[PDB]
Amino acid sequence: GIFNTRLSRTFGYTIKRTTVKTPSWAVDMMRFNINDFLPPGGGSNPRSVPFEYYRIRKVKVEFWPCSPITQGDRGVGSSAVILDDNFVTKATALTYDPYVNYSSRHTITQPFSYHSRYFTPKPVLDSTIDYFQPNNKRNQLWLRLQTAGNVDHVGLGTAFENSIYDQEYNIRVTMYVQFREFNLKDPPL
Amino acid sequence: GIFNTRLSRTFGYTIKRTTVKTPSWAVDMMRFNINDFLPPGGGSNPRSVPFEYYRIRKVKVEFWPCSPITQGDRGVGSSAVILDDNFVTKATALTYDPYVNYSSRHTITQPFSYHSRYFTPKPVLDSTIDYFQPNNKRNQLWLRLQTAGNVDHVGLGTAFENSIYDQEYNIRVTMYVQFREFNLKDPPL
Amino acid sequence: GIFNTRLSRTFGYTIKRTTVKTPSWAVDMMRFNINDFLPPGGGSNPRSVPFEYYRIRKVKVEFWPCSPITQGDRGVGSSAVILDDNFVTKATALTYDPYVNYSSRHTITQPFSYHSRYFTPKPVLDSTIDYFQPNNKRNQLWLRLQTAGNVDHVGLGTAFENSIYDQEYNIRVTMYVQFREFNLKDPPL
Amino acid sequence: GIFNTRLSRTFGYTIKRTTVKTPSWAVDMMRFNINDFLPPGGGSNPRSVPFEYYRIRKVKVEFWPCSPITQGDRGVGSSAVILDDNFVTKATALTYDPYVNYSSRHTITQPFSYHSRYFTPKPVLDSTIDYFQPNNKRNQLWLRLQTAGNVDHVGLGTAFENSIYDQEYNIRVTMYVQFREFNLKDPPL
Amino acid sequence: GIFNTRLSRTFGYTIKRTTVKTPSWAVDMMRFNINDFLPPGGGSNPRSVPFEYYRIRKVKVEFWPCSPITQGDRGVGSSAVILDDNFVTKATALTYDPYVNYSSRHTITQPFSYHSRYFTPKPVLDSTIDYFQPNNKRNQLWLRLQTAGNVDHVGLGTAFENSIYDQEYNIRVTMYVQFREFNLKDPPL
Amino acid sequence: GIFNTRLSRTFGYTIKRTTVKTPSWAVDMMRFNINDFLPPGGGSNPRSVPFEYYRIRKVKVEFWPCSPITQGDRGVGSSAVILDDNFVTKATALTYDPYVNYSSRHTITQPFSYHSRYFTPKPVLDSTIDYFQPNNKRNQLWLRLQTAGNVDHVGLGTAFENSIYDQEYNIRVTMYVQFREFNLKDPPL
Ligand SMILES: O=C(O)[C@@H]1O[C@@H](O[C@H]2[C@H](O)[C@@H](NS(=O)(=O)O)[C@@H](O)O[C@@H]2COS(=O)(=O)O)[C@H](OS(=O)(=O)O)[C@@H](O)[C@@H]1O[C@H]1O[C@H](COS(=O)(=O)O)[C@@H](O[C@@H]2O[C@@H](C(=O)O)[C@@H](O[C@H]3O[C@H](COS(=O)(=O)O)[C@@H](O)[C@H](O)[C@H]3NS(=O)(=O)O)[C@H](O)[C@H]2OS(=O)(=O)O)[C@H](O)[C@H]1NS(=O)(=O)O
Numbered sequence A, B, C, D, E, F: 001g002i003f004n005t006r007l008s009r010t011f012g013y014t015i016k017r018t019t020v021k022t023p024s025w026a027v028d029m030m031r032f033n034i035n036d037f038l039p040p041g042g043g044s045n046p047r048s049v050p051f052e053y054y055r056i057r058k059v060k061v062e063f064w065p066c067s068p069i070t071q072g073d074r075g076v077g078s079s080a081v082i083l084d085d086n087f088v089t090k091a092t093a094l095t096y097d098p099y100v101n102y103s104s105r106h107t108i109t110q111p112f113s114y115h116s117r118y119f120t121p122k123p124v125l126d127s128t129i130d131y132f133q134p135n136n137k138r139n140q141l142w143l144r145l146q147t148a149g150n151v152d153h154v155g156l157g158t159a160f161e162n163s164i165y166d167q168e169y170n171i172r173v174t175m176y177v178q179f180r181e182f183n184l185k186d187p188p189l
Helices: none
Strands: A003-015 A025-032 A040-042 A045-047 A051-065 A075-080 A091-094 A106-110 A115-119 A153-161 A167-182 B003-015 B025-032 B040-042 B045-047 B051-065 B075-080 B091-094 B106-110 B115-119 B153-161 B167-182 C003-015 C025-032 C040-042 C045-047 C051-054 C058-065 C076-080 C091-094 C106-109 C115-119 C153-161 C167-182 D003-015 D025-032 D040-042 D045-047 D051-065 D075-080 D091-094 D106-110 D115-119 D153-161 D167-182 E003-015 E025-032 E040-042 E045-047 E051-065 E075-080 E091-094 E106-110 E115-119 E153-161 E167-182 F003-015 F025-032 F040-042 F045-047 F051-065 F075-080 F091-094 F106-110 F115-119 F153-161 F167-182
Touching: A003 A051, A025 A051, A051 A153, A106 A115, A106 A153, A115 A153, A167 E075, B003 B051, B025 B051, B051 B153, B075 D167, B106 B115, B106 B153, B115 B153, C106 C115, D003 D051, D025 D051, D051 D153, D106 D115, D106 D153, D115 D153, E003 E051, E025 E051, E051 E153, E106 E115, E106 E153, E115 E153, F003 F051, F025 F051, F051 F153, F106 F115, F106 F153, F115 F153
Parallel strands: none
Antiparallel strands: A003 A167, A025 A091, A025 A153, A040 A045, A040 B040, A051 A115, A051 A167, A075 A106, A075 A153, B003 B167, B025 B091, B025 B153, B040 B045, B051 B115, B051 B167, B075 B106, B075 B153, C003 C167, C025 C091, C025 C153, C040 C045, C040 D040, C051 C167, C058 C115, C058 C167, C076 C106, C076 C153, D003 D167, D025 D091, D025 D153, D040 D045, D051 D115, D051 D167, D075 D106, D075 D153, E003 E167, E025 E091, E025 E153, E040 E045, E040 F040, E051 E115, E051 E167, E075 E106, E075 E153, F003 F167, F025 F091, F025 F153, F040 F045, F051 F115, F051 F167, F075 F106, F075 F153
């Protein structure tokens, strides 16, 4: 019983100002979990979408700027796809862009420019070995939609060039999911 | 955002015994409401299936017998489709089968025989005028999935021939519904 | 169990003379209810025609004159289709013809001439809102044949030029209906 | 104004037990009249189906058993079509099956088996001469739908083999009729 | 007598400022009535457009900004189509965008960006049941153009992200209507 | 914004009796103005049809008789088309029919006979020079729909033969007009 749908979530991210003169970059990570998109249900149905299995097909991360088009001290960054839960260490002012030479690098124009990334994440099945599957719609694993313990999906790391002014963003993540085995429970009343 | 699914519900019905010698029939009615198939949800989602609109496409009423194949004093009844909320009055021992000459009559062999009816019900929009639409999948009205006040659908009346022995049935109603406008709400936690 | 047929009825209508010199017109509406055409039945069958449902297809109004051809003080009037049960106000002698400019106007010669109209009426579901359907034979609704509470249909209003003489007509109505769901009941005797 | 419809009626028939050891048969007759299917009407319409003429096209006699499938002392009988109102004399325990060598004989398995007969009856126009028409849909006579004096149609005789146990049946006769000349009368009220 | 035309109306909407730091959204509703587009007439014609019936085909809601392109603290919202008169409750600072996961969601870039929505509304025939028709130009109901009591059409709800600065808009609603039955009345003078 | 419609108006005309023995004719004129067909509007809309420009395409003058078919002293007259506002002088009993030799003469049978004239009128732009355009639908001038000062259109003159009895007529003029530039004004309320 397949049901392809779309789930979204919005949150903020700010790159604080720095008095540093050099071009330094701010590094951070981004994971994706389905608990943040799918709330708990009620009653005999533990989740709000009554299905048993799921598998995330795609994610769309949108960096919607919060800064005016008149803001100066512009910069240039990079967003890369990291499917293994080993990101570059979080840094405030690093002397280089680590994600620049990555094959999945897209340039981030800053601060007042929109940046989208559309990709297929991978689940963290074993963080010790960090193995994942290649892209195959027919062979992608089905995970279970747990009650409160779903596994973290992974796949984006960023590097933003710091500035004299604060750079704020409203990040909207949209997960395109595919469920299976409609499992609604209908007790009496 | 269409989602065709199937919702079921099971309950009992008994035709008590009678010392009456004549062939008399027991008349009863059967309505269908979605509150009995779809429970209330939890939180910002008032229902367990997160959709706004619905329209019932078909219903399958199954009379599953509870009586052995050795039971005697067998009989013959009738099930008809009544799409207007004006049934023959409920009777214990009526001297005739009212639903026999109906164009939608199917014979009910009793007591140990299975009887199915598959039809398209109609909602009770105005019980004073009792108007309904003909069968058209493209023009069928969309109703709202209310929180605790959904409208009764209608469409089956029965007439069972009484017997010296009690005739029990387990009735399984299956509604084939079609929802629209996925409306999940995801507050923070 | 479809059954197309024809029903009719006859009654009188008169236009009393007026000493007024100006061209004045007399206004009156016309409703249509089935209880006037279909008497009650007898016994278990509340109506003489054993069906549950109906839906009117067409109506044919016939203004049969009662007057001679030699009558003078001839005039001219109009009739129009009105599907809301909010007609022009009834009037004796109005200084203009309200129904003249309506798109559904058919001229009326007076006093000794035949006049006919052939159209689709509509019912009165909600007199507050006064809504209905366009002409469609497939999507027309099915009403219930009540015992003593059928709904009034609508669809004609008139305007007759007054005169010095009394103008009397014999009005014949004819309905073309379509029943369904043969519902005869055969108790013993 | 033709209207083909279907009228039904249900009643009982029992073959009482006998201590006789031999194979004996119980003979009985079956006539069909429209008064038993069509009740009287009400008011100016003397009958409940407002038509003038009729002619019976077919009849379906169904012997629905009342006995369990575990009942022993089974037997074998015969049902024949007798279109002339001269049946074999009614007998309780006759030493042979009279209807066995009839060209219209169908075997009746007893007691827990269903038996149907579908045929075209004939009216009793003159019981002295006992003449009837062959089967012709285009040339079949139209009779009048009288008020309380309709003519008996004829066409089935049976022979049931007696048993130590009582053999009960619920007999459902269905007449497929064809009316003509819709004659509804609509007085005022 | 069909006449397709276009009626417009302009009004303001402001999202007041908030000292709240989090991303919160301001929720509001939008209904459409023809009294706000069609004024009352004069004399025997109760309305300024001399027709009897109407049905709204489409509506174009245009959010024309009032804010400069240099305004900061930008945001992202959502507009959805709600055809049933049960909107999300009006809120000043809600912790999430309720209309984000709706199938009819369009993103609203704020504050200095234009947003249009072009859709087919539905009338509020019964607010208790909240039923409406699917899109069909041939089967769309004709309503009556009342004098001062027309029914509210429905179909848009919004969610705007709050800001430190006031966000003003000039909203221009354009209804594309279709009238019927030209009913001009021409008394003497 | 073109809108072709039809506007009507009804009024009386009587040819009084004369004791004169000779055949004499009664001459009269007939002009057409849009103020007599289109009333004043209300509010910011000065007219009831909300358009700016107009041009009259055709006019249908219908002489509906008021006299019985038994009336004697019958006669013969003439109706001609006069597109220049210089009619034959109005006369009570003229010794000849002036409009008889006109190329646009149609015979008027009197008194109980219907007479129609269907033609294209012309406006009175300059009564001193009396110039008009030939018939061309594509090149016909657009006039302005003034508030209370529209220009008179012209085009019919008549000659009725007098009689011992009074000859009354109900004259129905129908103008087929074509408007342009829908100019509805919708202030607030
Ligand atoms: O059915 C009854 O409850 C009952 O009916 C009558 O008694 C007979 C039985 O019905 C009859 N059975 S059968 O079903 O016909 O087979 C039979 O057994 O004989 C009995 C006795 O008859 S006898 O006495 O004549 O011998 C009787 O009514 S009457 O015959 O009309 O007088 C009453 O006893 C009773 O009817 C009354 O109640 C119903 C149900 O409402 S409730 O009672 O409040 O629960 C009333 O229904 C009202 O109107 C409808 C409607 O017109 O659609 C609804 O109105 C809402 O929807 C419209 C829009 O409609 S639509 O266009 O979408 O289709 C809105 O525009 C309205 O604003 C809505 N109403 S509001 O917002 O609440 O105001 C709604 O169900 C209800 O609304 S309300 O009550 O008007 O508010 C019914 O009208 C009333 N009878 S009446 O006499 O007042 O007409």
